[PDB]
Design a protein around this ligand. Sequence first.
Ligand SMILES: CC(C)[C@@H]1NC(=O)C[C@H](O)[C@H](Cc2ccc3ccccc3c2)NC(=O)CCCCCCCCCCCNC1=O
Ligand SMILES: CC(C)[C@@H]1NC(=O)C[C@H](O)[C@H](Cc2ccc3ccccc3c2)NC(=O)CCCCCCCCCCCNC1=O
Ligand SMILES: *[C@@H]1O[C@H](CO)[C@@H](O[C@@H]2O[C@H](CO)[C@@H](O)[C@H](O)[C@H]2NC(C)=O)[C@H](O)[C@H]1NC(C)=O
Ligand SMILES: *[C@@H]1O[C@H](CO)[C@@H](O)[C@H](O)[C@H]1NC(C)=O
Lengths: 241, 98
Amino acid sequence: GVKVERQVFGEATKQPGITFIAAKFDGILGMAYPRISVNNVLPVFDNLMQQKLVDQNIFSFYLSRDPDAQPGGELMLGGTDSKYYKGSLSYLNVTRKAYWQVHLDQVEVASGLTLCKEGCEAIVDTGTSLMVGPVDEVRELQKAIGAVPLIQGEYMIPCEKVSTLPAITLKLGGKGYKLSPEDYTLKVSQAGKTLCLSGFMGMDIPPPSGPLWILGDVFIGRYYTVFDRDNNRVGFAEAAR
Amino acid sequence: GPIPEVLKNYMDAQYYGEIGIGTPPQCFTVVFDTGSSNLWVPSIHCKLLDIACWIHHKYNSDKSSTYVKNGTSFDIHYGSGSLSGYLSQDTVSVPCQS
Ligand SMILES: CC(C)[C@@H]1NC(=O)C[C@H](O)[C@H](Cc2ccc3ccccc3c2)NC(=O)CCCCCCCCCCCNC1=O
Ligand SMILES: CC(C)[C@@H]1NC(=O)C[C@H](O)[C@H](Cc2ccc3ccccc3c2)NC(=O)CCCCCCCCCCCNC1=O
Ligand SMILES: *[C@@H]1O[C@H](CO)[C@@H](O[C@@H]2O[C@H](CO)[C@@H](O)[C@H](O)[C@H]2NC(C)=O)[C@H](O)[C@H]1NC(C)=O
Ligand SMILES: *[C@@H]1O[C@H](CO)[C@@H](O)[C@H](O)[C@H]1NC(C)=O
């Protein structure tokens, strides 16, 4: 293990709204850049680098995409873990050091719809479960695959339709990152019912930060992700499958 | 070397692992979130109105020999919700117990 000394953190006393009540986690440990730290508090990983508690200032995520799998995933501080990926890593420069933001070259539905046609900006966010894109472009996407709107930019797909959906490929660093329908759709469950949620949600993030696409857990689950603060880059390799 | 932090997966929607804050460590589950930059956990001094606090782990600074007070108020707004409280300083262990 590791002990990061002299870490400034929040003792939460109010959490209005409902989203924290039934969440599985007690809290959040942010791993983006200091630029977006509330009150300019030096982040855990920055404090870790300054205390030289790892040799490589990088950190990596494997996230399992079978919900019943053990382990559920792994965060490797200061390294990458070969157990969880196949082949070699391909890297992209960070474009704005705030979020882990990268240039996205395009998004292509295999049946021909192209979004982000001339390139756009994306963030690589382990704390977002779904892929996120602008409302209008996601609406077109969802129409191309036959999904229907649910609520708050989410969409559902009949489960029996999934296996025949088109693949969706994101282009990053000039390489194609394919997502099969099984990759980009999720089982959801409530009160004994099972349904299939589309893994793309529509949300407009206003300027000056936005617009931004988000590469969430849908993406990171298929592509093991390395976050490199030494070289301000993000790496992807195909995850164990 | 590299430190492994195993994570749990809930429903392909929430991924989280255990950390410690304090001496000795008080354990908490957290999202390791590449879309934000702050650490926080629920306080034992959370308001009675904070229903989420009732069923989550609470940091008690009185039980930590490494705690250093700060007290500056903070507010954070995420896409999926908001919260506020006050800052503190302590030792953070990853994992909670290694
Ligand atoms: C409302 C918050 C607190 C939290 N939302 C999410 O977890 C977001 C997720 O994307 C979830 C994943 C999700 C999506 C669609 C579902 C449909 C049917 C059953 C369960 C579903 C779960 N999205 C929503 O909650 C949007 C509202 C879904 C309305 C139908 C089910 C309502 C009862 C279960 C809601 C479980 N959701 C949550 O715990
Ligand atoms: C930097 C902090 C202050 C914060 N970060 C996030 O909101 C993203 C993060 O990954 C968080 C991590 C997070 C935090 C609280 C949660 C509470 C309940 C359930 C999931 C949660 C996930 N991801 C989301 O909120 C889900 C999708 C939001 C992505 C849109 C970001 C739009 C900008 C929101 C207003 C400015 N705030 C932020 O960007
Ligand atoms: C609350 O914590 C902050 C850090 O998050 C303290 O401010 C830092 O303290 C040292 C020395 O006082 C400086 O070198 C840093 O540059 C400060 N940074 C920032 C962003 O404030 C702050 O003093 C603490 N406050 C109290 C009242 O304890
Ligand atoms: C990426 O970043 C490094 C260091 O900032 C720089 O030397 C390199 O030219 C950049 N690569 C590309 C493809 O822009």
